[PDB]
């Protein structure tokens, strides 16, 4: 797994990142994961859900 057909040549930001609040992070997480449920990334999404659970209080 080494080339362009999967990976962008170059990536650059156009602004300095923005420190999304825990609540903004959580809203992004839930909206993104929820949109995603509708491919081994699913397992990382499960981990994102664990992060969500950790961002929910308790694993």
């Amino acid at each position: 797994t080494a080339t362009t057909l999967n990976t962008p040549v170059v990536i650059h930001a156009t602004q300095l990142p923005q420190h999304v609040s825990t609540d903004e992070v959580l809203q992004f997480l839930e909206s993104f994961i929820d949109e995603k449920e509708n491919t081994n990334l699913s397992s990382s999404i499960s981990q994102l859900k664990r992060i969500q659970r950790d961002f929910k209080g308790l694993p």
Partner: peptide, 8 residues
């Protein structure tokens, strides 16, 4: 963090 980027 949330950072707006440009990718190719």
């Amino acid at each position: 963090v949330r950072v707006p980027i440009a990718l190719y």
